[PDB]
């Protein structure tokens, strides 16, 4: 079955793979993150409650006072979104917090407080998010963009190759906390182990192991095994486990049990280890040279002298053995220090250590942190407990503790946010294991190590920084005042909190201005994974590897939609199905392929769970049950594609559209384009402009409805029902009774957004697309937006294209367009410019906006009214007067030189106290009248719905067929009816009606207050006049058009109609492209799009022929059914036998300008299907029509390719780039011309052009190019007199900026001069 707007124009759909998971709501990152941020969240985390429970309770400097936390609450905003964008306020909500003050007594902090006080306090204004997913900061709609950064936890990197120039790789182990001090363990080419804290000075690593109160005996107990030597009657025998001897060449003949095992000069084989462990050999015999370099573990003391025999971690010599042998020790514990197995890294590290106990280690750490000051044991304890071991200054998140347990092979993924002793010891153990040769290092670009922050987490962090500044103020006013007399709003002030959150949302590196000229550009700017910003890398520094697609971007981050230029691969765009995990990583759906059958359950995999399993590719053929029809199937195991068996697979992809993003899944035939041209096509499809009447794509991907409905430019119905009143302003839906609340009678009113300014100076319009009396369903479009049509997404328009060289006018990439295109007004885009004029406050008095103006006459002032402001509707030229303004000297606002327009909307804002003039009172009466009429129509329309409910209830149960309309309509309650649900319902509707009456009274009073009041404004401004010009820019030689595949081009000549190549029917082609761009720039998808567009228009022409002849619905039903079946096993399977002879005529009314065809991305329409659809129309099979010429009237040889391509106009127009300057203004500090176009400036004759004129022999051209034309002021006035008198001659002089160089060098101690 189909929805009623899907019976208007049902898009033909090729495609073979039956879908199982539809496209999710495309704005779920922004909305879900900010819903996670601001919501009443119990059990502590996440949200604002995490900040308010981690920075509170503020306890004082031993004054026994404490400011603890209760709850919070956000009130309603004073301004809704529309008034906020008009006036210019933030769209914020006040953050009320309930704080409590308690004050303890003397001698008992575990005793009773004498007095508490709990109260409401005001702090900050956090800006809310609109339903589109955007913020309104100062009247300009802004987006905060998700950041891709390093995941907190341990990270074992390897500084490969480059250091020490000898190939010896290093290994470092960066512990990355979420908030606190970093910690980098590393090696050096002497194989010592060095710690460092926050990239500061370097210490040997075991100095922190003493700082955790470990003795050296315990350190060697941890980081090494033991070797036991027993002195038993002969040559100091040894306990030997032969696994340590795997490949070691002994120094003697190892024999045991009267049997020679190992010979001198040979090594111990593995089978000799098997012999020694099979015979269970324990004690072997060593020479005196064997313990010549063995390292003792613990301290041995002589019992008689009370001295030290040998210190810990010391090699043993002959005299040390002679001392400890005669003291009474039979057991000797040493360490195993092999070449391959276990290096003595800990032992060499302890030999570099000068420290000896806990205190000296804490002193040295306190000295490397803060240099050159007296340490004290209390200060060293406090610093080292506040580096890693305190809840305040150090905090891994849950993400950090998960990565730190997972990368150390733990079990519990839950732990504390602070470190401990076992954590650092496990980091050093894993680092030594990586140095020993077992285990692997971790790459950086792997998406199991890249977390995604969003709006909620970054706003929480900035709010937390505001709170630690305010706890740095409250720890102030709390123990330095008189108690009890103050309340907790005199202490805490809202300036740092609001300053921090307002600086983050106002100007950050990630809170950026929304590129809004297209529904696609909105919905793909909100889905952006930027690597830049705070905590990430920078553009002009890094690098190589991060600008490259890793093998685990498959289905998380789009590989082909990224901006080319200085930041490729850093401004990644997130894919279609890609959600965000609980912790912040990326996850993507798959289908659990149990042992034979592809089960239709979806199952979200992260980036590290994907690697262990094995995933089938998306388009693998399966026969109606899930059984894979091949016995070799293409899969990918561990980041590496291969060919696997039938039933060793564990997952299949969901749909074939999931590698790409929503920018580059509206490209039909994407699998035929080379990836560079698909990148340029997706980026230019983002850069489109909305035309006047947007049409549709004939060749789409079916993804248009998700991008249109799941954005916020169309007016989606909330509750379905029957339309009651359509208008260009408003739309009224009457809600069906099986969707309807019992109370609040309810018929909905959609106030559309008519002609208003976007951010890119386009024209964001909404047009109603429903008829009257028409049913609508829940979840359905009512009003099309900009670049939409019937709920689809129509960016550009589809035109008749031919690929042929035509007389050179399409030489490199140019485009040649018939005048039939510009006559139909079909690229005529509508732009809106906002021109502001402020009435400031200066000396000699304030300014005047009135029209009594000097130096002007009738010809200027005829287009102004009697109070200076231009009319609404006056079509002005470039350089007239819009607002007349004179200062205590003409300073009237003028149209900037070049642009026409029609003044559509004038706003006047008045700072309160200033006298409103007659036009400001006219606008006040106008908006009073509009708001009065609008709220009165709200009351009338909802009262009409309420009375219709009363009529619907009184059909039964005491019905009065004639007596109902004899009495006035406001008394439909006291009629004959007992105590039932109906009199209860009439009482509830009377409650609703009296609520509407008193609500209408109070809301009209509040709206008169909002219109009548002034507005807070800039320091020293009287009134602001804003005027909206509405230019209509058509098309001309110089604009940029482009298709959807990377075929760019400046349109080069707008030919007449007659010159166009026509065919043997009569129709001229509209646009003549260039064929030579196809074999080099390998975008072969545009030719398949051209042929399938010609097939679509062939079906449309046959419908137009079968309908223009007034044929009955039977033949239309026949032909539309044949055009909708037409293919292989497909998904569509429609039938017109359930459309009932009236929808088929209206569906053919919508198909007569062409039949829309969906072609999904990697499961598209093959060549034979295009041929069979070109055979259904009577077009030629090869797609090529023979074409005549317009000039000569004789045939082009070798018939050419025509069809329809869907081409977009880009907003790089030519009357926005063109500029010229004879003599304008000059800069102030260096007397050179200004830069730019708005400032009337000159083009920079840069350095390489100076080199290119030195490279010729042009000497006078360069002399006037940098002395006369540019800098020397007396030289250029002499030049201007000489040019207007006909004498071409220059008096050179000196550049004045060289005198500026002399003054800047001379302002140092340097004495530069000019000799002779």
């Amino acid at each position: 079955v189909y929805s009623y707007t899907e019976k208007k124009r049902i898009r033909k759909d090729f495609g073979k793979r039956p879908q199982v998971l539809d496209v999710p709501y495309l704005l779920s990152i922004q909305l879900d993150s900010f819903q996670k941020f601001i919501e009443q969240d119990p059990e502590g985390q996440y949200g604002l409650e995490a900040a308010f429970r981690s920075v509170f309770p503020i306890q004082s400097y031993s004054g026994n006072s404490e400011l603890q936390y209760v709850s919070y609450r956000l009130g309603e905003p004073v301004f809704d979104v529309q008034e906020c964008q008009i006036r210019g306020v933030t769209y914020s909500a006040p953050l009320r917090v309930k704080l409590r003050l308690v004050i303890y007594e003397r001698e008992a902090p575990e005793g009773t407080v004498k007095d508490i006080k709990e109260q409401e306090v005001y702090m900050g204004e956090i800006p809310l998010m609109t339903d589109n997913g955007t913020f309104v900061i100062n009247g300009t709609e802004r987006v905060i963009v998700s950041q891709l950064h390093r995941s907190p936890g341990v990270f074992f990197d390897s500084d490969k190759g480059k250091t020490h120039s000898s190939g010896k790789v290093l290994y470092n182990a960066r512990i990355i906390p979420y908030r606190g001090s970093w910690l980098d363990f590393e090696f050096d080419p002497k194989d010592n182990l060095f710690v460092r804290i926050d990239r500061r000075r370097k210490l040997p690593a075991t100095i922190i192991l003493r700082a955790l109160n470990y003795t050296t005996e315990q350190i060697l107990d941890l980081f090494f095994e033991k070797v036991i030597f027993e002195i038993r009657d002969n040559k100091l025998q040894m306990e030997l486990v032969p696994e340590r001897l795997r490949g070691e060449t002994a120094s003697f003949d190892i024999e045991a049990n009267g049997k020679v095992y190992v010979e001198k000069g040979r090594r111990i084989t593995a089978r000799h280890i098997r012999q020694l462990e099979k015979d269970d050999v324990k004690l072997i015999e060593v020479p005196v040279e064997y313990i010549a370099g063995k390292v003792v573990a613990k301290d041995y003391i002589d019992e008689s002298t009370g001295e030290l025999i040998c210190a810990a971690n010391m090699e043993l010599s002959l005299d040390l053995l002679a001392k400890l042998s005669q003291s009474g020790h039979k057991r000797i514990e040493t360490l195993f220090t092999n070449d391959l197995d276990h290096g003595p890294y800990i032992s060499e590290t302890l030999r570099v250590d000068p420290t000896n106990d806990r205190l000296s280690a804490l002193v040295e750490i306190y000295r490397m942190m803060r240099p050159g000051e007296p340490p004290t044991r209390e200060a060293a304890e406090s610093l080292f407990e506040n580096l890693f071991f305190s809840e305040d200054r150090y905090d891994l998140s849950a993400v950090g503790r998960m990565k730190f347990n997972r990368s150390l092979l733990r079990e519990e993924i839950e732990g504390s946010g602070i470190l401990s002793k076992d954590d650092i010891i496990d980091v050093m153990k894993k680092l030594i294991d990586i140095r020993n040769g077992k285990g692997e290092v971790d790459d950086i670009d792997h998406l199991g190590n890249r977390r995604i922050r969003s709006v909620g987490e970054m706003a929480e962090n900035q709010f937390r920084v505001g709170l630690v500044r305010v706890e740095r103020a409250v720890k102030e006013r709390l123990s330095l005042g008189d108690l009890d007399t103050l309340m907790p709003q005199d202490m805490i002030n809202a300036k740092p909190i609001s300053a921090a959150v307002k600086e983050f949302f106002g100007s950050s590196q990630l809170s950026q201005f929304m590129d809004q000229n297209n529904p696609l550009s909105e919905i793909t700017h909100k889905r952006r994974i930027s690597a830049l910003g705070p905590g990430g890398l920078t553009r002009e520094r890094a690098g190589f590897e991060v600008r490259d697609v890793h093998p685990t971007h498959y289905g998380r981050v789009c590989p082909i939609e990224t901006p080319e230029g200085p930041n490729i691969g850093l401004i990644n765009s997130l894919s279609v199905y890609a959600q965000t995990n609980e912790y912040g990583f990326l996850e993507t759906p798959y289908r659990k392929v149990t042992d034979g059958v592809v089960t239709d359950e979806i199952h979200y995999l992260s980036a590290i769970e994907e690697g262990n399993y094995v995933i089938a590719q998306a388009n693998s053929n399966l026969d109606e049950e899930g059984h894979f029809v091949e016995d070799l199937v293409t899969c990918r195991s561990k980041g590496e594609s291969s060919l696997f068996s039938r039933d060793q697979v564990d997952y299949m992809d969901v749909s074939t559209q999931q590698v790409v993003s929503v920018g580059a899944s509206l490209i039909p035939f994407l699998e035929h384009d080379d990836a560079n041209r698909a990148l340029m096509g997706a980026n230019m499809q983002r850069q489109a402009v909305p035309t006047l009447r947007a049409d549709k794509p004939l060749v789409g991907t079916g993804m248009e409805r998700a991008v249109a409905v799941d954005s916020g430019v169309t007016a989606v119905a909330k509750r379905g029902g029957v339309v009651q009143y359509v208008d260009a302003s408003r739309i009224v839906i009457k809600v069906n009774e099986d969707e309807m609340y019992p109370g609040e009678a309810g018929i909905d009113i959609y106030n559309l957004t008519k002609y208003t300014r976007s951010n890119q100076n386009t024209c964001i319009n909404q047009m109603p697309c429903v008829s009257l009396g028409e049913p609508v369903e829940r979840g359905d479009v009512l009003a099309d937006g900009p670049s939409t049509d019937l709920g689809e997404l129509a960016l550009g328009q589809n035109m008749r294209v031919a690929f042929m060289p035509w007389n050179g006018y399409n030489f490199e990439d140019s485009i040649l367009v018939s005048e039939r295109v510009v006559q139909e007004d079909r690229f005529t885009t509508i732009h809106i410019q906002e021109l502001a004029c402020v009435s400031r406050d200066t000396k000699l008095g304030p300014e005047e906006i009135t029209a009594d103006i000097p130096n002007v006459g009738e010809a200027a002032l005829s287009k102004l009214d009697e109070s200076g402001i231009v009319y609404i509707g006056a079509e002005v030229t470039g350089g007239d007067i819009l607002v007349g303004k004179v200062t205590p000297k003409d300073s009237s606002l003028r149209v900037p030189n070049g642009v026409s327009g029609t003044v559509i909307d004038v706003q006047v804002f008045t700072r309160d106290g200033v006298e409103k003039d007659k036009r400001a009172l006219e606008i006040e009466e106008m908006q009073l009248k509009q708001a009065k009429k609008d709220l009165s129509e709200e009351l009338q329309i909802l009262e009409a719905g309420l009375f219709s409910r009363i009529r619907a209830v009184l059909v039964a149960g005491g019905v009065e067929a004639e007596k109902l309309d004899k009495l006035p309509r406001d008394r439909w309650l006291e009629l004959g009816l007992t105590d039932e649900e109906k009199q209860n319902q009439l009482e509830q509707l009377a409650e609703q009606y009296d609520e509407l009456k008193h609500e209408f009274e109070k809301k009209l009073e509040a709206k008169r207050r909002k219109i009548t009041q002034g507005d807070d404004l800039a320091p020293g401004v009287l009134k602001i006049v804003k005027v909206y010009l509405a230019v209509k820019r058509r098309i001309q030689p110089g604009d940029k058009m482009a298709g959807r595949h990377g075929n760019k081009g400046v349109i080069s000549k707008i030919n007449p109609i007659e010159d166009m190549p026509y065919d043997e029917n009569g129709t001229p082609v509209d646009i003549v492209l260039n064929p030579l761009g196809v074999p080099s720039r390998m975008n072969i998808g545009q030719i398949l799009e051209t042929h399938l567009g010609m097939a679509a228009k062939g079906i449309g022409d046959k419908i137009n022929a079968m309908l223009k002849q007034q044929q009955e619905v039977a033949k239309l039903r026949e032909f539309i059914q044949r055009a909708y079946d037409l293919g292989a096993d497909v998904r569509q399977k429609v039938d017109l036998s359930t459309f009932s002879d009236e929808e088929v005529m209206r569906l053919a009314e919508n198909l007569r300008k062409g039949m829309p065809i969906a072609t999904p991305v990697f499961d598209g329409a093959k060549e034979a299907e295009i041929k069979e659809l070109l055979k259904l129309g009577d077009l030629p099979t090869s797609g090529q029509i023979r074409l005549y010429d317009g000039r000569t009237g004789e045939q082009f040889e070798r018939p050419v390719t025509v069809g329809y391509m869907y081409m977009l106009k880009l907003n790089h127009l030519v009357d926005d780039k063109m500029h010229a300057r004879s003599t304008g203004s000059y800069s102030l500090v260096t007397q050179q011309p200004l830069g730019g176009k708005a400032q009337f400036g000159g083009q920079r004759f840069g350095e390489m052009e100076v080199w290119a004129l030195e490279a010729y022999g042009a000497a006078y051209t360069l002399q006037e190019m940098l002395t006369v034309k540019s800098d020397d002021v007396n030289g250029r006035t002499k030049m201007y007199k000489n040019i207007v008198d006909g004498n071409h001659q220059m008096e050179p002089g000196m550049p004045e900026s060289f005198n500026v160089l002399l003054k800047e060098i001379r302002s140092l101690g340097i004495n530069i001069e000019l000799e002779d």
Binding site: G808, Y809, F811, E812, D813, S814, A1018, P1019, P1037, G1038, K1040, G1049, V1050, S1052, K1053, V1214, K1217, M1218, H1219, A1220, S1222, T1223, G1224, Q1232, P1233, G1241, G1242, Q1243, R1244, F1245, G1246, E1247, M1248, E1249, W1251, A1252, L1253, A1255, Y1256, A1258, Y1260, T1261, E1264, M1265, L1266, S1270, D1271, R1276, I1283, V1284, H1288, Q1289, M1290, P1295, S1297, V1300, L1301, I1305, S1307, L1308
Partner: protein
């Protein structure tokens, strides 16, 4: 500079000089009223560090800032590097009598001429038109001539066709790589708003027509017209200076 809001976001130099004069006046007052023995030392350290912030900020240990993270600009940051007087103001300058627009093809040109709009040719060539007006006697002063060419009356297009005729312009593509990147043409007036540029010539600019933009300059003096005709004309440079290969290869 005023920011038109009642306040002056000052330049960094006045901040630096203001810091030196504050610290110096406080040091004069502390040497006046006697320094507390081993005391007249911290203030001189502060003065030395403020002067070292003024002459070259950031060369001594951690630099200063006004707002917020960015270190502010001393004198050596005005002479050195990019954004300084050697590379931004003295070796490459901003230049009057110049303009820029988007290029296009127009293959009906001879290779020594390029299309150029009527609006650009009227705004680049203004004082030539003023001179021809008060030399032919169609405006008494300069102000009547300026208002005539602002209204664009029906006679100034004949003046403009009489000043373009044998007068070269310099076309320039924005990444000039080698010396064929600046060439000189003789303009032809075009109804429209783009620069029609001969196709063969676009082998030397490495310029396609997918939105490229080129800038035109005007040689004012007489010797510069002769140098843009004899040395830099588009017919003269047909061989590259890298080898003997022709640069007019048909593309």
């Amino acid at each position: 500079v005023p920011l038109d809001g009642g306040r002056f976001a000052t330049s960094d130099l006045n901040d630096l000089y203001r810091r030196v004069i504050n610290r110096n006046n406080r040091l004069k007052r502390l040497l006046d009223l006697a320094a507390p023995d081993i005391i007249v030392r911290n203030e001189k350290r502060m003065l030395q560090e403020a002067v070292d912030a003024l002459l070259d900020n950031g060369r001594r240990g951690r630099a200063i800032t006004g707002s917020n993270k960015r270190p502010l600009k001393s004198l050596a940051d005005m002479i050195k590097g990019k954004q300084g007087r050697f590379r931004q103001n003295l070796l490459g300058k901003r230049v009057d009598y110049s303009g820029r627009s988007v290029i296009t093809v127009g293959p009906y040109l001879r290779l020594h001429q390029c299309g150029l709009p009527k609006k650009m040719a009227l705004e680049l060539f203004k004082p030539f038109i003023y001179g021809k007006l008060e030399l032919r006697g169609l405006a008494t002063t300069i102000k009547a001539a300026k208002k005539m060419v602002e209204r664009e009356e029906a006679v100034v297009w004949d003046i403009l066709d009489e000043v373009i005729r044998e007068h070269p312009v310099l076309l320039n593509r924005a990444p000039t790589l080698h010396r064929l990147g600046i060439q000189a043409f003789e303009p032809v007036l075009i109804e429209g708003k783009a620069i029609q540029l001969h196709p063969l010539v676009c082998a030397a600019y490495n310029a396609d027509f997918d939105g490229d933009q080129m800038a035109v300059h005007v040689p004012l003096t007489l010797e510069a017209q002769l140098e843009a005709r004899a040395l830099m004309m588009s017919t003269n440079n047909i061989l590259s200076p890298a080898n003997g290969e022709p640069i007019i290869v048909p593309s």
